Amino acid sequence: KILHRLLQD
Amino acid sequence: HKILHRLLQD
Amino acid sequence: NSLALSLTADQMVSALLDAEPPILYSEYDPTRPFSEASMMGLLTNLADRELVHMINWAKRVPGFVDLTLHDQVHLLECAWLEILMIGLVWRSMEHPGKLLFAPNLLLDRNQGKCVEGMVEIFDMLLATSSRFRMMNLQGEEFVCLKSIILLNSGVYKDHIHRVLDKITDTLIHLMAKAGLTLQQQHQRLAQLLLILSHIRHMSNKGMEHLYSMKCKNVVPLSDLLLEMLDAHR
Amino acid sequence: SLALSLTADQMVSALLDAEPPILYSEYDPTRPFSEASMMGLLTNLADRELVHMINWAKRVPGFVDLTLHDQVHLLECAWLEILMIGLVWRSMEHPGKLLFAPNLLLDRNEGMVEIFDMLLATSSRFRMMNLQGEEFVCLKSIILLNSGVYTLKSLEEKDHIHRVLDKITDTLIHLMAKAGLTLQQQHQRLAQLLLILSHIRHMSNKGMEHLYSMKCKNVVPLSDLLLEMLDAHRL
Numbered sequence: 001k002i003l004h005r006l007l008q009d
Numbered sequence: 010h011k012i013l014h015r016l017l018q019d
Numbered sequence: 020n021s022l023a024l025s026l027t028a029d030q031m032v033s034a035l036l037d038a039e040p041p042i043l044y045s046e047y048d049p050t051r052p053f054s055e056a057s058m059m060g061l062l063t064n065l066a067d068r069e070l071v072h073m074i075n076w077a078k079r080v081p082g083f084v085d086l087t088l089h090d091q092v093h094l095l096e097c098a099w100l101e102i103l104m105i106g107l108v109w110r111s112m113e114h115p116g117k118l119l120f121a122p123n124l125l126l127d128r129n130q131g132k133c134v135e136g137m138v139e140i141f142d143m144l145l146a147t148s149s150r151f152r153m154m155n156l157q158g159e160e161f162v163c164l165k166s167i168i169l170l171n172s173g174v175y176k177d178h179i180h181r182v183l184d185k186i187t188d189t190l191i192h193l194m195a196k197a198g199l200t201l202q203q204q205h206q207r208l209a210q211l212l213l214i215l216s217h218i219r220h221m222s223n224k225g226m227e228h229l230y231s232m233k234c235k236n237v238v239p240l241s242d243l244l245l246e247m248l249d250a251h252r
Numbered sequence: 253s254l255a256l257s258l259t260a261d262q263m264v265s266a267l268l269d270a271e272p273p274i275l276y277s278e279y280d281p282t283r284p285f286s287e288a289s290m291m292g293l294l295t296n297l298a299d300r301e302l303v304h305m306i307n308w309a310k311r312v313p314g315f316v317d318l319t320l321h322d323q324v325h326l327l328e329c330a331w332l333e334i335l336m337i338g339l340v341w342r343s344m345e346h347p348g349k350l351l352f353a354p355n356l357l358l359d360r361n362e363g364m365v366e367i368f369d370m371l372l373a374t375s376s377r378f379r380m381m382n383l384q385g386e387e388f389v390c391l392k393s394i395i396l397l398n399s400g401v402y403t404l405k406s407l408e409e410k411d412h413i414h415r416v417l418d419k420i421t422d423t424l425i426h427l428m429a430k431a432g433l434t435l436q437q438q439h440q441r442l443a444q445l446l447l448i449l450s451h452i453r454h455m456s457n458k459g460m461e462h463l464y465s466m467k468c469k470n471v472v473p474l475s476d477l478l479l480e481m482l483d484a485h486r487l
C-alpha cells in the first residue's frame with residue numbers, strides 16, 4: 001500500500 | 010413543473 | 020428589509036422551536052425489516068411524508084421566506100437529505116447503537132447489514148448520534164444547526180449571509196445562557212459546525228445510494244422524492 | 253504530545269513552515285488539448301502534489317501521534333478536500349479563474365463545469381472575507397483531522413484528534429482577536445470559515461464521483477497512488 005509506505009518512511 | 014414550486018406557495 | 024434580522028436571540032429561538040415539524044410514525048406492522056425491499060419501502064414512505072413537513076418548516080425559518088421562490092427551491096433541493104439526516108441523528112441520541120427513524124421504527128446496524136452499501140452510512144449516522152450525545156446537544160442548539168444547514172448548503176448571497184450570522188449569534192447566546200465561558204463557547208461552536216461537514220458527507224453518500232435504489236426497481240419513489248433526487252443529478 | 257503544549261503563535265508558525273510548495277503543470281499553450289489530455293495534466297499535477305501533501309501532514313502538530321492506520325485513513329478521506337482548498341486559495345486573486353498552477357490559469361469556458369463554478373464561488377467567498385494565510389493553514393489542518401475522524405481502544409485516538417481540533421479553534425480565535433475583531437465579529441467569522449468546510453466537503457464528494465466516472469471509462473491514465481486514494485472512497 002503506497003500511502004502507508006510513504007507515511008511510514 | 011416541479012412539485013416543490015407548488016408546495017412552497019400554499 | 021427582512022424581519023429576521025430584527026428578531027432578538029430569544030425570539031429567533033422561539034421562532035425555530037415553533038417551526039419544528041412533528042416526529043412522524045412509520046406504518047405499523049411489527050415486522051422488523053431485514054430486506055432491501057421492506058426497509059427501503061418503509062424509509063421511502065417516511066421520508067416522503069417528512070418532506071411535506073420540512074417544506075412548511077422551511078417557510079417558517081426566519082429569512083427563508085424573504086428569498087425568491089427559485090432560491091427557496093434551490094436550497095431545499097440541496098439540503099433536504101442533510102435535514103432529514105440531522106433530524107434522524109437527533110432523534111437517535113437517547114438510543115445508542117440504534118437509529119430511531121420513527122418511535123415505532125428502531126433499526127440497528129444488523130438490519131443495515133442487509134441492503135448493499137448501507138451499513139457504512141448507518142455507522143456514520145450512529146457515530147454522529149453518539150457525538151451529539153457526548154456533547155449534550157440541546158434542542159435549542161439543534162434547531163439552530165438545522166436552520167444553518169438549510170441556508171448554507173446551497174448558498175453558492177448577502178441576505179443569507181446576514182441571516183447565517185444571526186443564527187451564529189443565536190447559538191452563542193444559547194451557550195452563554197447555559198453558563199459557558201467565552202472559551203467554552205467558541206470551542207463548542209466550532210465542534211458543532213465541524214459536524215455539519217460530516218452531515219454533508221453522509222448526505223452525498225446517501226444520494227448515491229438513493230440514485231442506486233432508483234436505477235434498479237425495488238421501491239416506487241414518489242414523484243416528489245424523484246424530483247428531489249434528480250436535482251442532485 | 254507536544255502539539256497540546258504549543259501556543260497559538262507557535263501553532264501558526266508550525267503550520268506556516270509546514271506549507272507545501274506550489275507546483276507547475278506540464279501545460280503548453282502551443283500544444284492542443286482535449287478534455288482527456290487536460291484531465292491528464294491535472295492528474296499528473298495532483299499526483300505530484302500528493303507526495304508533498306503526505307510530508308506536509310507529518311508536520312501538522314498531533315498527526316504523527318496517531319497510528320499509521322489512522323494516518324492513512326485521514327489522508328484517504330481528505331486528500332481531494334485539501335487539494336481543493338489549496339486550489340481555491342491560489343485562485344483568490346484571479347476572479348472568474350482557477351489557478352491550478354502558476355502556468356495553468358483556467359477560466360470557465362459534463363457537470364465538470366458545475367464543480368468549476370462551485371470552486372469559483374468558494375474562491376469568491378475567500379476574497380470577500382479577505383481570508384488570511386494564517387487562517388488558511390488552520391482551515392487546511394482542520395480538514396485533515398476532521399474529515400475522517402468519523403469514518404476497542406481506538407477511542408483514545410479519537411479523543412486526541414478532538415483536543416488538537418480544539419487547539420486549532422483557539423488558534424483561529426487568537427488570530428481574529430489579534431486582527432482587532434470584536435467578540436461578536438470573532439464568533440461570526442469563525443462560523444463563516446467552518447461553514448465553508450461543508451462546501452469543500454461537498455465539492456470533494458462530487459469530485460470523487462467524476463474521477464471514478466473517469467477511471468472506469470479508460471479515458472485517462474490515473475497514477476498508482478491516485479488509484480489507491482480513489483479506491484478507498486469506493487469502500
Ligand SMILES: CC[C@H]1CCCC(=C(c2ccc(O)cc2)c2ccc(O)cc2)C1
Binds near residue numbers: 059107141
Ligand atoms: C441508513 C440511513 C439512510 C440510508 C438511506 C437514506 C436514508 C433516508 C431515505 C431513504 C429512502 C428515501 O427515499 C429517502 C431517504 C432517510 C433519512 C432520514 C429519514 O428520517 C428517513 C429516511 C436513511
Ligand SMILES: CC[C@H]1CCCC(=C(c2ccc(O)cc2)c2ccc(O)cc2)C1
Binds near residue numbers: 296
Ligand atoms: C474532478 C473535479 C476536479 C475539480 C478541480 C480539479 C481537480 C483536480 C485537482 C484539484 C486540485 C489540484 O491542486 C490539482 C488537481 C484533480 C484532477 C485529476 C485528478 O486525478 C485528481 C484531482 C478535480
